[PDB]
Amino acid sequence: GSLTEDGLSYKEKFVVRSYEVGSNKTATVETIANLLQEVGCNHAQSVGFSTDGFATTTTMRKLHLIWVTARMHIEIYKYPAWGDVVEIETWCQSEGRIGTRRDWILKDSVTGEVTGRATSKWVMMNQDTRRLQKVSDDVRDEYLVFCPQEPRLAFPEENNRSLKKIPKLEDPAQYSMIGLKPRRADLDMNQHVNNVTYIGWVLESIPQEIVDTHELQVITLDYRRECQQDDVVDSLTTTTSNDSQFLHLLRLSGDGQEINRGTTLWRKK
Amino acid sequence: GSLTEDGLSYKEKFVVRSYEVGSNKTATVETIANLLQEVGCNHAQSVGFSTDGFATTTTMRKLHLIWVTARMHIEIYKYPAWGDVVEIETWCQSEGRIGTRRDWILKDSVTGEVTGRATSKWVMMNQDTRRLQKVSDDVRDEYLVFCPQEPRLAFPEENNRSLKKIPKLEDPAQYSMIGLKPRRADLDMNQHVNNVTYIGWVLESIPQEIVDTHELQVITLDYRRECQQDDVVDSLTTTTSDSQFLHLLRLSGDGQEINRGTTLWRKK
Ligand SMILES: CCN(CC)C(=O)c1ccc(N)cc1
Ligand SMILES: CCN(CC)C(=O)c1ccc(N)cc1
Ligand SMILES: CCN(CC)C(=O)c1ccc(N)cc1
Ligand SMILES: CCN(CC)C(=O)c1ccc(N)cc1
Ligand SMILES: CCN(CC)C(=O)c1ccc(N)cc1
Ligand SMILES: CCN(CC)C(=O)c1ccc(N)cc1
Ligand SMILES: CCN(CC)C(=O)c1ccc(N)cc1
Ligand SMILES: CCN(CC)C(=O)c1ccc(N)cc1
Fold it and tell me: For chain B, what is the total number of helices (H) and then of strands (E)?
């Protein structure tokens, strides 16, 4: 991997592994989400920010401030097959004092064609109080010299899916998977549940017949609260719709506290 | 990755990823086990066998025969840090008509030092009846031209840890993690639970204080039965001692054994 010529974006190639693929012998969306996080982390390293997933400056570290994901939105046109080489380009942009955005473009390395795209919204939070805060000029200025100054969007479209508000699923859910719990493999280096595990949990309540006959085209996921030590999660799904659409809700199995909400769009194979 | 000069082994380099590391910022043993499976699969591919994890010939495919893991044994001297490049060499060997063995050697690409080693026992089974079978001459001959003819062992010593019999843990277990269940990410391309998921489940019942103060040095795991559709697993652990543990995975309901194993940990 390397920063590009102008130093405002980062590119890295990956060869799809045997254990990274599903029943069609192509990469799962969780494998894609993991590669997006990996290239994001290598971009942060390439310019001197923290490499713990929080991409902080020394200024944020003394204030105990971190960046956290508020939303992930992925659209895949073609999942890469096992053994295929995928090239991913990523870049970041400030969105005033609200937060930051990281975008990605996925390409087939052999054809050069765009096979997927993704975008994410990040907010600044105190790591101890968990209180959100607006971005100060000092923090914004530190990041601005590492971002394009003119807008560069993976999702330029007028009223695109990545910015739509997601409603709260109402009981009874059509489908559910109960009592989901993380194991050590689901944790990151900071002992926090990896953001990709929540994508897996959302997908667990999609019936197997949909997965066997359809391909996931778009997923939008809001992150509202973390799954903490000893927490157990229920995954709820209701059909909202050759295309099938679903509304998703992850909540704590006991008191029903919301942890995530999302939507998925699937195309018939 | 590529076959080596003599064509009887395969080498491949991997750069440790951000999501592949634990609290010490070094690769977990499940990341190591996944890389061992990946290099095994690329070796099978390089010589024309199936690439579904079963490494079959056309002869085995017409008979509905597959190779399955009976035991995995891994010894790690140093876990690679995030960003480090690790080189893994692998080869296989027939063990008469009982089955086959795959061995691996892990090295730090910069220093050339051996940082780990692993070995595994595989048996031939009919994929439908699940009945084990001895290896016929026809199948053995197909594999022999792809294996070293003189013994080459990652664990050469007579009576080493990789060959020891593992006892069955007796209730009550000292520690347990109950109701473990796979999700789609735990499945392979054939919709079977990945062998590495069982390593993760075994480790779940080790108390967090051991993991925080020790490093896993050796793991030996027997595979007795698969976790099938809608199965739920209990992970049981008892200290037998460095710290040593005895492990048992069994189905949550009737208590049917699926795996047994042992782990050896060194104080940090
Ligand atoms: C979205 C979080 N964040 C810091 C703002 C980053 O990942 C980041 C990384 C490299 C870079 N040049 C600029 C930003
Ligand atoms: C509805 C609140 N919310 C997400 C927490 C936002 O408006 C938001 C917008 C841009 C961004 N980079 C980060 C966050
Ligand atoms: C207006 C769309 N939008 C912000 C992108 C949201 O509703 C949103 C709210 C909370 C959250 N964690 C993530 C997203
Ligand atoms: C006991 C299972 N387990 C994962 C190891 C957890 O409950 C757990 C959840 C969140 C977290 N940050 C850390 C740990
Ligand atoms: C242990 C299963 N098995 C087939 C015997 C293999 O993985 C195998 C792969 C490549 C090779 N040259 C020889 C053997
Ligand atoms: C005790 C039975 N058993 C394991 C099933 C074996 O003797 C065994 C030995 C070598 C080998 N490649 C495969 C199997
Ligand atoms: C000491 C002999 N030996 C094989 C090495 C075993 O006890 C053995 C038995 C069953 C199994 N699935 C794996 C291993
Ligand atoms: C419903 C959860 N789940 C994983 C998708 C399973 O019970 C499962 C277990 C083994 C297997 N081969 C296939 C599936």
Answer: 5, 12
Same domain for A62 and A129, yes or no, is yes
On whether the CB atoms of residues A229 and A216 are closer than 8 A, the answer is no
> What is the sign, positive or negative, of the torsion defined by CA atoms of B178, B182, B186, B190?
positive
Give the resolution to one decimal, in Å: 1.6
CA closest to B27 among chain A residues = A189
Ligand 4 atom nearest the C-alpha of A186 is 4
Apex CA A208: angle with CA B232 and CA B249, to 5°? 15
> Do A93 and A201 have their domain in common?
no
B230 touching chain A per CB within 8 A? no
Helix (H) or strand (E) holding A212: helix A208-213
Which range of residues forms the domain containing residue A153? 2-163
**Is the CB of residue B209 less than 8 Å away from at least one CB of chain A?**
no
Based on the structure, what is the number of domains in chain A? 2
**Do B20 and B91 fall into the same domain?**
yes
State which residue of chain B sits closest to A50, comparing Cα positions: B18
Helices (H) and strands (E) in chain A, counts: 5, 12
Q: Which residues contact B56 (CB under 8 A, 6 or more apart)?
A: B49, B50, B65, B66, B67
A10, A16, A19, A250: best mutation site toward chain B, by most B Cβ within 10 Å? Answer: A19
Experimental method reported for this structure: X-ray
HEC string for A23-53: CCCEECHHHHHHHHHHHHHHHHHHCCCCCCC
- If asked whether residues B138 and B191 sit together in one domain, one would say no
**Cα A65 from Cα B34, distance rounded (Å):** 34
- Residue B169 falls within a domain, yes or no? no
How many pairs of residues across A and B have Cβ atoms under 8 Å apart? Answer: 78
Among A43, A79, A177, A184, the residue to mutate for chain B (most B Cβ within 10 A) = A184
Q: Which residues of chain A from 172 to 191 reach within 8 Å of chain B, CB to CB? A: 179-181, 183-185, 187-189, 191
3-state secondary structure of B44: helix
Chain A residues inside the 8 Å CB shell of B82: 51, 189
CA distances from B176 to A141, A179, B246 (A): 51, 17, 12
Q: Which amino acid does the sequence have at B241?
A: S
Q: Which CATH number does the domain housing residue A179 bear?
A: 3.10.129.10
- Which tokens belong to B34? 């996944």
Give the end-to-end CA distance of chain B in Å, rounded to a whole number: 34
Q: Which ligand is nearest to the CA of A93?
A: 1
Last residue of a domain, one of B156, B188, B215: B156
Please indicate, yes or no, whether residues A25 and A139 belong to a single structural domain of this protein: yes
